[PDB]
Design a protein around this ligand. Structure first.
Ligand SMILES: O=C(O)[C@@H]1C[C@]2(C(=O)O)C=C[C@@H](O)[C@@H](C2)O1
Lengths: 162, 163
C-alpha cells in the first residue's frame, strides 16, 4: 500500500463531488467556473495550511490542480448533457460542501504526515502506485483517471538538481 | 448520398467550435451566448419564411446544431482544464469565427431547400445515415464529433412533404 494512498483516495473522493455539483448547476443554469470563488477557496486553504504549519504555496498549487480537475469533470458532464439533456441526473449543495470540507482536512493531514516523501525521489513511484490502486478500488473511468492525474501533478516536489 | 453536402456543411460548422472555444478560453468568456443564438435563429427563421421554407423545421434543426456546438466547446474546456498547455494560444477572433458560421448557416439552409423532397421522404433516414458515414470518414471525425453530428442532424428527417 502506497504511503500516498490515503491522500490520493481523498483526492479522488473529492473529484467525485463534481457530479452532484454539475447536476445542480445544470438544473439551476449556473456556470461551472467562477474565478472569484476559486480565489476565495484557495485563500482559505492557504490559511488552513498556515495554521497547520504546512507550506501554503504548495497547498495552493495542489488545490488549484484539484479544483481545475474537478471543473474538468463538470464541463465534461455539461457536454454530455447538451448532447442528451434527458440524461442530466438534485439536491442542494450542502452535502457536497460538508464533504469537501472533510476531504480538504483529510488531504491537508496527509500533506503534513507525508511531507518528507512528497519532497523525496521516491515520491513519483509512490504516487504512481497510489493512483493505480485508487483507480482500481474506486473503479475510476477514463475521465476520472485523467482528472486524478491533473489533480495530483504537483504532489511530488522538485529535487535538488545536483 | 444526396444529403452529403448538407451533412458536410453541418460537420464543417461543428469544427468552428474549436477556434470559438479557444478564443473564449483565452478571454474567459462563457460558452453559451443566448443573444447570438437568438440573433441567428431570428435571421434564419426570416430567411426560411422569405424563401417559403417551413420555419419551425429550420429553427429545430439549427437549435440542434447550436446545442451540439456548445457541447463540443464544453468538452474542449474540460480537456483544457485537465491540460491548459493544449489550448490554442492564438485562435482567430470570435468575429471571424461568427462570420464563417454565418456563411455555413446560409449553405445549410440552401441545402435544406434544395433537398426538401428527400428530407421529407421515407428514404431520408437511410440517406442521412449514409451521408453521416461518409462525412465522418472524409473529415476523420472523432468520437466527440460523431456524437455531435448525430445530435446536429437528429431532426433532419422531420421535414413535411409539400401540400
Ligand atoms: O459564441 C458562438 O458564436 C458559438 C457558436 C454558437 C453556434 O453554434 O452558433 C452560438 C452561440 C454560443 O452559445 C455557442 C454556439 O458558441
Amino acid at each position: 500500500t502506497s504511503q500516498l494512498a490515503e491522500l490520493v483516495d481523498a483526492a479522488a473522493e473529492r473529484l467525485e463531488v463534481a457530479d452532484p455539483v454539475a447536476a445542480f448547476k445544470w438544473r439551476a443554469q449556473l456556470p461551472i467556473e467562477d474565478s472569484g470563488r476559486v480565489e476565495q477557496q484557495l485563500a482559505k486553504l492557504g490559511e488552513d495550511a498556515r495554521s497547520q504549519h504546512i507550506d501554503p504555496d504548495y497547498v495552493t498549487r495542489v488545490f488549484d490542480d484539484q479544483i481545475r480537475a474537478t471543473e474538468a469533470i463538470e464541463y465534461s458532464r455539461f457536454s454530455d448533457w447538451k448532447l442528451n439533456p434527458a440524461s442530466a441526473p438534485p439536491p442542494d449543495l450542502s452535502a457536497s460542501r460538508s464533504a469537501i470540507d472533510s476531504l480538504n482536512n483529510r488531504m491537508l493531514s496527509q500533506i503534513w504526515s507525508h511531507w518528507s516523501l512528497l519532497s523525496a525521489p521516491s515520491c513519483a513511484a509512490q504516487l504512481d502506485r497510489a493512483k493505480r490502486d485508487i483507480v482500481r478500488s474506486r473503479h475510476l473511468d477514463s475521465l476520472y483517471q485523467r482528472a486524478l492525474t491533473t489533480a495530483t501533478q504537483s504532489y511530488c516536489q522538485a529535487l535538488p538538481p545536483a
